[PDB]
Symmetry: C2
Subunit: 359 residues, 2 copies
């Protein structure tokens, strides 16, 4: 009862929140208060105390297969009746979600922001002193945020940083722009897209390349780079057609570019201008030849990623004679007819047409 | 066919554009242009030559029962061939959507704005004739209910004549004068002047695609037309009188509950407050704060009165309605034990169990709960 004066500010990965309430009043590590919490959960009016963790790690609410729904309920009354002025506690929890990306990477929600994959480091991370402490470490690329040359791996003697071995993970120029971009600033050479799309497209550059100087060369010519990468890869795989010479089926014509940039992770056309510009170069040139873009072979399974269906509306659309039959697994229909009924009967307010060119 | 384009306007309706391009190309009436356009689509052999309408009120893509794909594809061919400079016509078109409104109302989309279906006028549309007399082009706000007064001249929309023959601009042309007789034709003013995007009065401001859902929410609760006087009065005492009506209605069906104080469904404890404010048009509760404060009441009032709110019984398909999932994904929650139970229709789950479930498994970047941490 009555944890005196919850102080803190934003930008924290919730692990030092228990450390900052540990350094008050005189207490060793966090095993006592962490037992006295789960003892208080074992106390009055509670049902899910058995799975609240024991160690330095695992306070994370995705570390168990099925105590995810028990950890947030544990975290519900862990702020209200144990703090004077109950602080911003909920929302700091790095949860899991139902979302994915196109390269089949697991999405993960912190409070509004999505990391590329729930794999990144989880162990043996660098750390810098004189804050309390950070939000952004235990990740791939978040190093300095203004003050540089701070890696701090502890080859010399014990207790360099003055905290008390709580978080303290230590064992015995283009990088400054991207570090300020992932921490959140103005970043004048970059088009100011939010952190769900910031980390959402770092893996999109990591997925197609299989590198901070190779990072910023794609962003120094940002109104030219995506238009140049789409025009030199469309001439690839044209002499390798499958039927006779043309009318190429699925997976062979832009099967990597189109199936790698859709819903990463949210379907907004205001910020994710990749989806609007790939729609531009593919459909500023609608009918070039007989069977070049529109007159191709498409399937209804890869059509519901744009149409937003669950294979239940197709039994009421093709029998109502909107999409003319020219069947679930065959490359039957065409790209030009499926996209146009999407524009005619499957629009939205933010996932719509009136956000790309012309501005 | 070579056509000269008129001056573009962002607030011009779709039907009036075919009328004002029939005026500058020498037509007596506008239906003669629709017959010549169908002949032009027949010559170029584009797929819309079977179902191109020669009638003015069915030129919209939602009027076609099965040829909306043939309608907008012909809109793409006319935008790039018969004009010297391509105009913006897809923003002028009115296209359907799969996103529904509460409880079962469909919706339609024009440009970057989603309109309701129950407010769509299936009858004759009124007119402000002095806008047709000075400017000559009509507005797109006349196609849907709620927009009663003009936001530019503060004058009411005149529906019919003094004799009985109503005028509509879709037939005779937009000079504004009838066919048969052919004669010259604060709260309501409040709800007029923050529809076209005007950000000046303390009535609440939304991206006005979401605002029509706020108009549609007012008609579903009151079960009448979109009232204007109490609409200003309800938002003048915002958000103080909102939570009182929430409190007086959860007191209502609990004082007059039929079964008991427990073993109840969430009907007759949240009957119309929960099922009538879900999808307007999306649950992004920073925008539609009618769900951001409803799900604020669902957070701060969980575990009082010996779990009176945490013993509301639910079935399986309410998770498909609320939490945006399917019935097959619920069976994955049972086999790998993330959801713990205690068939689709049978009532088996619990409320404090399901509220802490979607903060851990069913929270997207758009559908967050952190968006109102500074409101309560």
């Amino acid at each position: 009862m009555f944890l005196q004066r919850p102080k803190p500010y934003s930008d924290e990965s919730l692990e030092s929140f228990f450390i900052r309430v540990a350094n008050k009043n005189g207490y060793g590590d966090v095993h006592r208060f962490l037992e006295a919490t789960k003892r208080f959960l074992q106390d009055i009016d509670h049902n899910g105390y058995q799975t609240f963790p024991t160690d330095i790690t695992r306070i994370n609410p995705y570390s168990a297969k099925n105590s995810s729904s028990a950890r947030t309920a544990s975290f519900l009354k862990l702020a209200q009746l144990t703090f004077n002025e109950p602080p911003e506690l909920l929302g700091l929890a790095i949860n899991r979600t139902n979302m994915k990306y196109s390269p089949s990477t697991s999405a993960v929600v912190r409070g509004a922001e999505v990391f590329p994959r729930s794999l990144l480091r989880t162990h043996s991370i660098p750390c810098c002193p004189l804050c309390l402490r950070e939000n952004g470490y235990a990740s791939y690329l978040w190093h300095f945020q203004g003050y540089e040359y701070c890696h701090s791996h502890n080859v010399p003697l014990i207790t360099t940083c003055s905290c008390g071995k709580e978080f303290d993970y230590r064992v015995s120029e283009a990088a400054c722009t991207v570090s300020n971009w992932l921490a959140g600033h103005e970043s004048k050479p970059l088009p100011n897209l939010p952190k769900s799309y910031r980390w959402g497209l770092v893996h999109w550059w990591m997925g197609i390349k299989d590198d901070h100087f190779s990072f910023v060369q794609f962003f120094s010519n940002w109104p030219r780079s995506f238009h140049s990468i789409i025009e030199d890869e469309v001439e690839f795989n044209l002499e390798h057609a499958v039927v006779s010479t043309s009318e190429l089926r699925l997976k062979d014509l832009l099967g990597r570019l189109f199936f790698g940039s859709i819903r990463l992770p949210e379907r907004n056309l205001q910020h994710n201008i990749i989806l609007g510009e790939l729609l531009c170069y593919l459909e500023n040139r609608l009918w070039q030849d007989k069977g070049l873009i529109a007159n191709l072979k498409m399937n209804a399974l890869e059509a519901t990623v744009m149409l937003n269906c669950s294979l239940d509306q197709i039994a009421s659309m093709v029998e109502q004679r909107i999409l003319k039959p020219n069947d679930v697994t065959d490359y039957l229909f065409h790209f030009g007819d499926i996209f146009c009924l999407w524009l005619a009967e499957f629009q939205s307010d933010e996932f719509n047409r009136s956000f790309y060119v012309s501005r």
